[PDB]
Amino acid sequence: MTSSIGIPIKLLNEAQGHIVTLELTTGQTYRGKLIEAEDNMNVQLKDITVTARDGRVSHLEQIYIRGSHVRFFIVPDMLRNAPMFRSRNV
Amino acid sequence: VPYTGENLARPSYGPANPFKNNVLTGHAEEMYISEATFRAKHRAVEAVGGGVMRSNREMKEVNKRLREMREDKGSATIADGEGAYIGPWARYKR
Amino acid sequence: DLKRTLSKLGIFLKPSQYKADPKVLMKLVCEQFFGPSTAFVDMVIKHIPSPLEAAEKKLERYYTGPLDTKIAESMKNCDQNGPLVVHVTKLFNTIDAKSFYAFGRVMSGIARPGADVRVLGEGYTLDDEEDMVVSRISDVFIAETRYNIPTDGVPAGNFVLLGGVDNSIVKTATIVDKKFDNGEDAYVFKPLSHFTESVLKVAVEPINPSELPKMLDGIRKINKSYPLITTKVEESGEHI
Amino acid sequence: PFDRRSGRMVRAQDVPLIKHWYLEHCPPKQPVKVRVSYQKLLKTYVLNELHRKRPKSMQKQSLLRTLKQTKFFQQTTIDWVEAGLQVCRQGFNMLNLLIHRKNLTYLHLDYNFNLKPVKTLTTKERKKSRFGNAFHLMREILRLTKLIVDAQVQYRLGNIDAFQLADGIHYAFNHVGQLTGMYRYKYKLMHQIRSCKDLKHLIYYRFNTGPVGKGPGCGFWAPSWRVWLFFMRGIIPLLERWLGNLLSRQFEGRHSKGVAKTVTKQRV
Amino acid sequence: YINWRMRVTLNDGRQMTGQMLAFDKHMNLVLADTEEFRKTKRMQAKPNSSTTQTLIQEEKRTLGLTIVRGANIIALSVESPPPTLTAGPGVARPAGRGAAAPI
Amino acid sequence: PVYFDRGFMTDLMNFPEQIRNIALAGHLHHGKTAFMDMLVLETHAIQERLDKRTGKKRDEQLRYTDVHVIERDRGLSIKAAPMSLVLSSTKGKSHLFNIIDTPGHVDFVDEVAAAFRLVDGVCLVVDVVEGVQVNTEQIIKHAVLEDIPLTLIINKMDRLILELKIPPTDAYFKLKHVIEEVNTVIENTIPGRGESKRLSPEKGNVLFACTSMGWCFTLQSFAKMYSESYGGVNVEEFARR
Amino acid sequence: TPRTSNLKAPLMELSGHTGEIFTAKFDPTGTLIASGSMDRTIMLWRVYGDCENYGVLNGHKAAILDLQWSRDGDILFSASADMHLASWDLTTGQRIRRYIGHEEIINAMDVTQRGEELLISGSDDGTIGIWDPRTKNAVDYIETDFPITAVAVSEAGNEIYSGGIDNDIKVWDIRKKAVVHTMLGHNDTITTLRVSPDGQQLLSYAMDSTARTWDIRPFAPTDRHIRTFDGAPLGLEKNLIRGSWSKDGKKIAVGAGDGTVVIWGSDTGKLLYKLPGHKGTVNCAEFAPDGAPIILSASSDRTMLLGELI
Amino acid sequence: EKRKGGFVETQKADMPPEHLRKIVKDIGDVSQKKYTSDKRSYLGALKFMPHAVLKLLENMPMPWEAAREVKVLYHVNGCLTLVNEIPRVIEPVFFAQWGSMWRTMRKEKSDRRLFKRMRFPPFDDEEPPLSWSENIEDVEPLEPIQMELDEDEDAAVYEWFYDHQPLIDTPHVNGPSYKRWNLTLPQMANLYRLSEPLVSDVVDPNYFYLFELKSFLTAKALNVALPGGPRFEPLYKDIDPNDEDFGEFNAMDRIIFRNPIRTETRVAYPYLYNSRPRSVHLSWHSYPQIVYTKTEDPELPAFYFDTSINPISSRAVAPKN
Amino acid sequence: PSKEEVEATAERTKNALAALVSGALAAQKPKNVQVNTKREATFVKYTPSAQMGNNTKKQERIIKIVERQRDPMEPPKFKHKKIPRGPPSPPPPVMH
RNA sequence: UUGGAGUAGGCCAGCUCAGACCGAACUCAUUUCCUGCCUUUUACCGGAUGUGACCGUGAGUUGGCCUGAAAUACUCCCUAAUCUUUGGAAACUCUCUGGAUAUCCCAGAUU
Ligand SMILES: Nc1nc2c(ncn2[C@@H]2O[C@H](COP(=O)(O)OP(=O)(O)OP(=O)(O)O)[C@@H](O)[C@H]2O)c(=O)[nH]1
Ligand SMILES: [Mg+2]
């Protein structure tokens, strides 16, 4: 069998380069520019605004986030209007 | 308005003339019956034995008596000589 | 046998396509093998700069104005919220060839329809402002050669096709906003530096001397449409 | 089409076999008649492409399919030689029936479609029997058809072999102007005759090189046969109209005046 | 079931609401025009009543498009359904009705 | 009809970092309009109309960006021709490409100059058979003197396989000869720093293509094919080797 | 002679079928018309505006013997002598599906409009098919032993009035699949069966040229027959003539083989109209459902007449 | 459904050929008084005789066929027999068949001692027409012109090459209506080789530079003749230099004269080299040069470094810096 | 007259003249083969009048009329004739 | 992985469209002009200009014919080794913060 990739995973791949806001299993919300996302949803970010559930607001650069420990992501409406949502019949 | 039941019910007054066909021999009107209707009524008049309470089994015996009134069709595996096929060109013996 | 080989590779076609002509079959098998132009897209993304990266180079290479200004900063950062600057260098004539859509690059701002602009010629300076015409951008297209997509606005770092700013442009123009909000002046981009010479010389006159003004208008349109063409009137009254 | 592996089937007359011979440059060292032939064939090709049309044959009914819809026409499969014998017999009987209805039985139509008087004609008879262009063009076309069908009949009887058959067909389609008077009733048929002569020059010169001598034996008849099929294509609407009007006069009479005469030069 | 409106309940007890777009074999949920619900049971102790009414405040916030991690979805509730005539041969004309039609 | 969304294209216009402005430039008839045809047929739904063509016009090349009547009659480009396409990378991310297709005749280098003024990078299309020709040299000189970044597209690999009919080792040598000829013109224009602007397939700025058959690859993308087939290869190291 | 409708003319003629028009029905809003005819087609018209044939539905292999609309006018159902029913989406003009299972000509069909939608069909194999308009397979079928030519659904939605060769209007209960009771009195085969808009009475027209109104409310005497309207002779074609009630229910119309649509008063019994206009038998006569005085008559003339009752 | 017009409808069938044969034999020459009621139609069908001539002559057999059967549409009088066929052919197969005829005919003309041309007309003027049934019907036909094909070399077309409609029962055609074909590579190669006397050698489209339709039309509009091309009546007989007398441009003292511009250049660049270029056509400028050469040695593989190809040297590549 | 009366007149006259134009066209171009595929039947209702000599009523008659299949090869049957034109319509009073 | 909707091939006939390439092919007529040849016409020369016809073609659609096949099948729509569904769980104390505030309780966070 030939391995296909999931639509949310390739949506992360199309979301690379934009200002994504995600949050993680310790209840932590991170904002910034995504620079690489892989099929196991491991991501990096570069201009991170940090809001941790203990009330910790901070800002730093170049973080690595595990896809097992992430909870969800937020991406813009143009990435809603991306071409892969047009189901090309083959 | 001219086709109201009252207007159609009222008749023309006056005594009759003491003294309207478009054909010289009658009245002809263009009509739109069905082809099956015409063919069935024409058949009812045209076939012999019109009406007649008569079932499919006795259809089969009437056809049997007619089919041995007809002559012998032949075998259709003998090309020449006696016994050859004549089929639908068999004479009704009279 | 072909079905066997391509099924080994994982390439599948309809059997009619299998019995198709060799050239169409070859194109179909190449589509199933190589796929689309993702290799070209990767190469260009990796080895060619963004407008956000090449704006500074193109400013220091082709801007006559001072580089330490806020309009220079807006063009350097490709800000779509800044003043409108479009560097028009090509003119594509319309379908009936009655006018010349001005094709250029939006450097800063957003080029949007019904917008009052100043079209600046190749010889516009602060003291000598004869090569400046106030006009209005009337139509804005994304050009697709075979067709045009009319839009409500083309942002910075992009290519725009402008209708309405046509007449004053001869070879190259800089279309700037009417008045910048910082109280700062406008400067033009440098002319094109072509890399061959127009050395072949042809004289024209009309067959109808009454129709000679039509030759003048057509020669103007020719001079607009062809960048390296140069038209003169030699003093014997002969058009060159 | 040899770069293809699939296609649609085309008409046998729509395959030109030597069109690229005259479409490419002429080979070196050719006679002047051959060079002129190459140029005339190019001229016909360029004029065809220049006057290329684009009609709308939509209201088109097929004649043979309408006739097939009727009860008076039936369908069967026969040999081509049988069909040709029938067509030649039918054409002969038609022209003979027309002659006899017009009471011109002092004219004899023979089986090769020659029309001759059987005696010396008076002036009155010569006038009543001066046939016209529609009759005579149809008679010469049936004469050519007879010549072709008769060549096939000779081959099928066994009097000639197949090489002689092909050579005779090629001779006939190249010598229409000598074997008929079809040009005498339609003078643009000289365009068709000239086309066949140009093809004869090209084919002959490329065919009789080296060990192949000069004389009869060339049976490469498809180009000339093509030419006469396309001539027929153009001549059908014209002759079917003309023959229909011949039959209108024969069967309901001539309307003499009534449609007004124009003011010609002699009437000004 | 694609392009219906969905409410998804997540393992700590959250709710993510709105229009869903796609899925995968891992049932990762992408969903658009989202607003989020937190069921925070707040102890709004009134100064006049001694009964501490633990009111489940369902606070909401709009975010946009979600990409929910597939190892986190608990519950999915469906809410609402998603949001060539060639002209014929016929002519129509005024006409009369007839002469008399006697009974 | 297109296979993307034009509103999405306008939003890609709004974000100015994922945009590339490129010009396709090269010698006469080396395949620039044909490369644009490849991209147009990937993005646009016009294959059914091209299939409904019959005869010699069914054999005709599309040439989407040639629209002038001189272009359709003479068969060469004389005007520059811009298009804006939403193309996809190997990772699947849509980008915006503003591409200007330039002429290749040595007379319309004014069109080439105007396009080079507008664009940020130049993809140079070079026929693998003829190699570096006169307008290839002219365009190389102008591009590197204006300091425009340069990538290379070696075209007509079907002419390698089907016309010349040379074995694959000699095909490698032919490709190496063409790439080194391009780099030789680079070096002879800027001595001492052509190595800083070196074009070679192992770096990934050389693309092998056949535009009549609609395919292209880099070594990195071909190693990515090997990665997707056999699983678990290190793609950059494989392409380098 | 006043103007009593928003038509282009007090009477208009719609032509374009190339065969006998066997059925013609109004929209539930009374602005569209679907006509099914023996050229195996359905033609879709707009009555207002001016008039426009806006649709043609093809796909049936034989004559369109009956049709009906949905509750809101987006799905059209039709029974045809190809032994099939069919449902058609009218926004795309395309056949949703076919309902298969009848073994002879499907003479009549009706659609249950209230509660939840159903299809009822009466056919010459002696069957009454109960069809759900989502499955091609029949939910149920009542099995008689005589051909059935007219069917109607009670407003309650679970009784079916069916008449056929046996000259008796048999009222059946669906859930029992069994005959409740037989209204008797007709002498020839019932051609139409229609309930009044208020729902307490049943018009039936048979081939003995008598249009009888019957009672439907459960409290009624042993003889349930209200009245026997006359004035519409069956001609020489044994067609299934389809009458109707007025929207207010005071008028009652059938077609008649002398080309005449005949209208009586359902309460009184007097012949209100005997409108002419057709040269074949008038197979269908339909009052407008929006309360307008518009009458529609469809005949075996390959045309129909749409007039106003001034 | 079987009576959707009032009656049971069936397809029109073919009759026996003996039926048509009996009809024409009975009517003969239309001489017996029985056939007067046919005489008006017979003579009336004369109007349609041109179609019958075209249909027969286009469905005529090819030199490799001894006999051909054709469908005919005949009148029940015996007045008009119309060949109801179109001679539809696979164009590669038809090329190969006539190329094989070219070669076979040339061999026979070199090998025959004396070629006796057959007489025209083949029959006498007063000789009555022959009969199918008594002169042709069952007569043994002679051998048609056919190439001796090769059981091994021409194996790919061996069984079917000279059939009337080749491959009509095989999956290489759409069906008996003979409208679409598909052939294999061995079959196509064998047909190309058999059609070798009549195939164009031209591979480069640059061969027809200034010798193609647009150039011919431009030369016609310019009233000039290309070398080897056709010549026409002028498009514009209006311009003479004496009419274009000494106004401004015709000054021989003003024009610099180099070596002269030719007619081919005037046609190749019609808007630069002509003052009034009306109705001229812009021809295709160039094509990329074809570097394909046909291999003569048949033992050579598909991919090989040909001797005609200039060699690639390591120091010809030479990465310098 | 008003626009509605002018358009009613134009429709009536366009119909009559169009029928004559079709007649003239079919006369000017005979339609190659003079058979029709659309050879459907007309039905006529036929109520008869009495008889020559009988006044007894007799049965109503349905007539199926079809156009006859004529042989497409046939020329027209009858030779045309020259007849002098008939007298005019009765001349009107001379109102001088 | 499925339910929903589908049913073959060949051939014949009709209808509707299609050229900018219906047609990798090629004829005829004719309008208005120009040239030529010509005692008048027809039959002609060869250029322009439009306008018809004829020999053909494709796609869609509808009906029929021929040979099969027959709950078979195909056709579409749609679908336990770490890194994710084969787990560090489950339970609840202690401490801290907030509400209540004398506590109980509860929330958040931590071990
Ligand atoms: N063998 C081969 N020929 C090709 C290929 N691509 C294009 N061609 C041919 O090359 C010729 C010229 O290509 P064009 O499409 O005109 O490309 P171009 O470089 O834009 O030409 P110009 O605009 O004049 O510079 C065309 O006739 C194509 O058929 C290819 O990939 N392989
Ligand atoms: Mg190009």
Side-chain angles (χ1 to χ4, degrees), chain F residues 24 27-34 36 61 63 65-66 71 75-79 101-105:
Chain F
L24 289 173
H27 194 69
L28 178 71
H29 291 148
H30 277 210
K32 303 166 288 284
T33 307
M36 280 293 254
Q61 187 197 349
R63 280 157 72 224
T65 61
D66 287 358
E71 286 178 310
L76 73 164
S77 301
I78 69 152
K79 297 304 166 190
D101 176 60
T102 76
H105 205 268

Side-chain angles (χ1 to χ4, degrees), chain E residues 88-93, chain G residues 13-16 43 45 51 53 303:
Chain E
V91 309
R93 60 174 194 84
Chain G
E13 180 169 88
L14 322 183
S15 197
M43 291 171 72
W45 314 80
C51 287
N53 189 179
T303 189

